[PDB]
Enzyme design. Structure first.
Site, mmCIF file in Angstrom:
data_model
loop_
_atom_site.group_PDB
_atom_site.id
_atom_site.type_symbol
_atom_site.label_atom_id
_atom_site.label_comp_id
_atom_site.label_asym_id
_atom_site.label_seq_id
_atom_site.Cartn_x
_atom_site.Cartn_y
_atom_site.Cartn_z
ATOM 1 N N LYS B 62 59.008 61.841 28.428
ATOM 2 C CA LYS B 62 58.164 60.838 28.611
ATOM 3 C C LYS B 62 56.624 61.499 28.235
ATOM 4 O O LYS B 62 56.004 60.826 29.138
ATOM 5 C CB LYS B 62 58.275 60.252 29.764
ATOM 6 C CG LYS B 62 59.860 59.049 29.398
ATOM 7 C CD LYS B 62 59.731 58.131 30.685
ATOM 8 C CE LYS B 62 61.503 57.596 29.986
ATOM 9 N NZ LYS B 62 62.417 58.661 30.055
ATOM 10 N N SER B 117 63.567 49.938 29.624
ATOM 11 C CA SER B 117 64.818 49.574 30.098
ATOM 12 C C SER B 117 65.007 48.756 30.785
ATOM 13 O O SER B 117 65.450 47.725 31.250
ATOM 14 C CB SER B 117 66.317 50.530 30.009
ATOM 15 O OG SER B 117 66.180 51.222 30.862
ATOM 16 N N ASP B 178 75.848 46.912 27.418
ATOM 17 C CA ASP B 178 76.931 46.738 27.332
ATOM 18 C C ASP B 178 77.025 48.145 26.085
ATOM 19 O O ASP B 178 76.437 47.495 25.266
ATOM 20 C CB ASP B 178 77.606 45.187 27.210
ATOM 21 C CG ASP B 178 78.715 45.679 26.411
ATOM 22 O OD1 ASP B 178 79.405 45.657 27.283
ATOM 23 O OD2 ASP B 178 78.910 45.801 25.381
#
Ligand SMILES: O=c1cc(O)n([C@@H]2O[C@H](COP(=O)(O)O)[C@@H](O)[C@H]2O)c(=O)[nH]1
Ligand SMILES: O=c1cc(O)n([C@@H]2O[C@H](COP(=O)(O)O)[C@@H](O)[C@H]2O)c(=O)[nH]1
EC number: 4.1.1.23
Lengths: 215, 215
Positions: B62, B117, B178
């Site tokens: 990152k 996220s 998912d």
């Protein structure tokens, strides 16, 4: 910090990093160690420096991950002996809180990076920086990083965090920032290349201190 | 990537990391190694993994510093054998370009992290994410990271980067994402805890792949 000057030790060789840090140690009491040195020589370099020079070590790891990964990075960093870690504020409050939780557990400190000093900081970070600083205040952060290259922004950041908070500032020297002007708002300045690439690092550090003492 | 599944190996112990990675190697061809493992075991762990498992290694660092420091971080990371490095786009174009320059010099790849996220990503990153992705396209970036936890955002990011760009996505499993829905937009999913904290990591990986094959 001693003389309000923090050395950014970004040399990537242990022998050169040790040489320069030893030459300027009489002028500082705090060394910022980042990834250029740690990824080249290992995390053990933090405890080696702390021991050899008896200086405080700020791990400049610009932590910028999700909360769970941030907690792991902070735990590994404090286990390695770092006194403080620098954390980005832009990924949000939960990511900063994760670092504050580990620092509380381990008796260490978190520095919150608000606005950055380079030109690209104007694209996205600058517009969010005041809010990132306010988030820091709301979370109880007491240590911050702001830009020497934009003293008007450093002033606005000092305004948000208050006089009690500790503010350090990079971008002095190589990036164009001025020691004296930056110290109008920050408590200490961070200096890397102006000192570690100098033909005489001790003379460069002494020169900076002389201009600071005059303030 | 094999089975469109990338293992996020965030265990902090070399023995546990090697055990789990070996157990699931038949189901992947790419391992994401980040700071939790590297700061605990050293940069040599990247070449060890690449050799032992013959897998591609994405260094999830990152990267989020000024251009000069980003260049040093990238050089150290590719010298350690990483095939690619993940870079934050929030710090701006010059910081991303510095990483692209080193990747070009060393024959490696840069992945640009757009939106994150975790919940905190909504505070500052999400509002800048479409622009960060557009910046990537303008700079010639071909590999991107976007969130499994917000498939509508993953869809918009895919729209900006085009079908030719490679998009990988974390947040599957533990964070709520998912596999199947995420793969409607991303080329591959990143999975960490759902596999490495499982009582049987190989069974967990196999389970995910079975649900992927059905797509
Ligand atoms: O906004 C910021 C935040 C930083 O930590 N830094 C860091 O501070 C140091 C600046 O070093 P230099 O004096 O050589 O420009 C580097 O280690 C850099 O990574 C910066 O330059 N700007
Ligand atoms: O937005 C992002 C970007 C990431 O790299 N990651 C990384 O992806 C992995 C997610 O792992 P997990 O499946 O355990 O939630 C972690 O290594 C994390 O640091 C993420 O979770 N969200």
């Amino acid at each position: 910090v001693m003389n309000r000057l923090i050395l950014a030790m970004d040399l990537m060789n242990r022998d050169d990093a040790l040489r320069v840090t030893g030459e300027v140690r009489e002028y500082i009491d705090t060394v910022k160690i980042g990834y250029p040195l740690v990824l080249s020589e290992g995390m053990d370099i933090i405890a080696e420096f702390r021991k050899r020079f008896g200086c405080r070590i700020i791990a400049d790891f610009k932590v910028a991950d999700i909360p769970e990964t941030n907690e792991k990075i902070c735990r590994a960093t404090f286990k390695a002996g770092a006194d403080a870690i620098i954390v980005h504020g832009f990924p949000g409050a939960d990511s900063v809180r994760a670092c504050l939780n580990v620092a509380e557990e381990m008796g260490r400190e978190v520095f919150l990076l608000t606005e950055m000093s380079h030109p690209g900081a104007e694209m996205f970070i600058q517009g969010a920086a005041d809010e990132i600083a306010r988030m820091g205040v709301d979370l109880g952060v007491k240590n911050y990083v702001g830009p020497s290259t934009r003293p008007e922004r450093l002033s606005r950041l000092r305004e948000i965090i208050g006089q009690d908070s500790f503010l350090i500032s990079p971008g002095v020297g190589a990036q164009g920032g001025d020691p004296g002007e930056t110290l109008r708002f920050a408590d200490a300045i961070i200096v890397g290349r102006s000192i570690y690439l100098a033909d005489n690092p001790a003379a460069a550090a002494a020169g900076i201190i002389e201009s600071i003492k005059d303030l």
